[PDB]
Every structure is written in structure tokens, then in C-alpha cells.
Amino acid sequence: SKLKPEVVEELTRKTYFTEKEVQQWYKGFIKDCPSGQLDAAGFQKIYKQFFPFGDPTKFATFVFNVFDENKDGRIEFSEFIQALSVTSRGTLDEKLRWAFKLYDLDNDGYITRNEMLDIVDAIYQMVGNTVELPEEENTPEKRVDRIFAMMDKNADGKLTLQEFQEGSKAD
Amino acid sequence: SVPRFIKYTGYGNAAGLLAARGLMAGGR
Ligand SMILES: [Ca+2]
Ligand SMILES: [Ca+2]
Ligand SMILES: [Cl-]
Ligand SMILES: [Mg+2]
Ligand code: NA
């Protein structure tokens, strides 16, 4: 697990990680994925190990496809470390820009309510829902109806990145 | 109790946190 100096340097410049951290993450990545290429089954396995009695298939597939920047069916280390940099160390706006890419499942530049429901449902399928009374059931649908309407300031049935990024931000 | 960050489900932050935790497990 020896990363070529130029590569380390470039990945360090492109992320929030120090050169030491990049090399440490590489060493762990190669230990877990000796070929340097994480496939979709291995990615879902990680999440099943987190939630062995939820169903992580949908969430893992959605996130894998966003992480797989060159869409070759594999997460290479450059994709691994850049995905980790943004999702773990980005500013709030950078993290929400990444999430917008995840939620915009058809890549048309907007989040529609069906897309928000797909991600939210995927999250509940994996991690579960909060137990409530049958009369106050924690359904993805009613949660999405609330948040989406709140974000859709111009009520055109679609969310721009601007509308999405302002969703928890206080004014 | 309820997981801390599931209040952000649908806002983007929950998906981001869960994505990061999976990557971290993949590198440890
Ligand atoms: Ca790839
Ligand atoms: Ca869309
Ligand atoms: Cl979310
Ligand atoms: Mg479409
Ligand atoms: Na809108």
C-alpha cells in the first residue's frame, strides 16, 4: 500500500486532509479493499454491518452512484477520499451541495418531492423509524410533505439548490 | 431517545453523515 508521492500531494491539495491523513486513509482503504476498488456489494456490506435488520440496499445504491464519479462501477481511492473530505469536513454549504447531488436523482437540476421521498424512505428502510402512536405515525410521506413545502418558497413543485441550502439555515 | 441527526432527515445532513460513516468504516 504505497501511494505515489505526486498522487498523495494532489489528493491532499484537493481535500481537507493532511498528507499524513491521506496516507493513513489509503492504508486503511487498501487493507479493506486490497485491489483499491470498492464495488457495490462491499459498500452495501458496510451498511448491513451497521444495520443488520434494516434494508440498506436503496440507500447504499444511491450513495454509491454519487461517490462513483466516473461511473465505472467501482469506488477508487481518489473517489473515496474526496467523498469523505466533503461529507465529513465540508462547510455546511459544501455538505448541502453534495446532498443536493444525491437527492437530484435524475440530474435535472431540481429536487422534486418524489426524489426527496426516495432518499428519505431509503434512510428509514436502513435505520428504522421512531415508534409513535398510529395516529401520529412517523411516515416519510408526511415528513417530506412538511419539509418540501417549507423549502419550496415559490411553490412550483421543485427545489433549487438555493431553496434546499436555506432549509435549516436561520435568517 | 432518538438518533441525534435524524431530525435532519430530508434536509441533506442525515444522508451526508451516514455516507461519511460508511466511508470511514470502509477505511478502518
Ligand atoms: Ca469510479
Ligand atoms: Ca431532479
Ligand atoms: Cl438527509
Ligand atoms: Mg425528470
Ligand atoms: Na421552488
Residue numbers in the entry:
A (entry chain B): 6 to 176
B (entry chain P): 402 to 429
Article sentences:
The neuronal calcium sensor 1 (NCS-1), an EF-hand Ca2+ binding protein, and Ric-8A coregulate synapse number and probability of neurotransmitter release. Ric-8A is an ubiquitously expressed cytosolic protein with two main functions: it constitutes a molecular chaperone that allows heterotrimeric Gα subunit biogenesis and additionally, works as a guanine exchange factor for Gi, Gq, and G12/13 families. The structure of NCS-1 consists of two pairs of EF-hand motifs, of which only three are functional: EF-2, EF-3, and EF-4. The structure of Ric-8A-P bound to NCS-1ΔH10 can be described as a coiled region followed by a short helical motif (R1) that is connected to a long helix (R2) through a loop.
Three different peptides were synthesized starting at residue 400 and ending at positions 423 (P1), 429 (P2), and 432 (P3). The crystals obtained with hNCS-1ΔH10/Ric-8A-P2 grew using microseeding techniques in conditions containing 0.5 mM Ca2+, 100 mM Mg2+, and 100 mM Na+ (see Materials and methods section). hNCS-1ΔH10/Ric-8A-P3 crystals grew under similar conditions to those found for Ric-8A-P2. Although Ric-8A-P3 contains three extra residues at its C-terminus no electron density was found for the C-terminal residues P430, E431, and G432 suggesting that they are disordered, exposed to the solvent and do not participate in protein-protein recognition. The structures solved with Ric-8A-P3 (Structures 2 and 3) were virtually identical with the exception that the Mg2+ ion is present only in Structures 1 and 2. The following discussion focuses on Structure 2, which is determined at the highest resolution and statistical quality. We used the best quality data set (Structure 2), in which Ca2+, Na+, and Mg2+ were present in the crystallization solution. The anomalous difference map shows 6σ peaks at EF-2 and EF-3 metal sites while no signal is observed in EF-4, indicating unambiguously the presence of Ca2+ at sites EF-2 and EF-3. EF-4 shows a residual anomalous signal when reducing the σ level, which could indicate a low occupancy of Ca2+ at EF-4, consistent with the observation that a fully saturated NCS-1 does not recognize Ric-8A properly. Taking these observations together, a Na+ ion was modeled at EF-4, since Na+ was present in the crystallization solution, does not scatter X-rays anomalously, and is structurally undistinguishable from Ca2+. We did observe a Mg2+ ion at the surface of the NCS-1, close to EF-3 and located at a special position where atoms from two symmetry-related molecules participate in the coordination sphere.
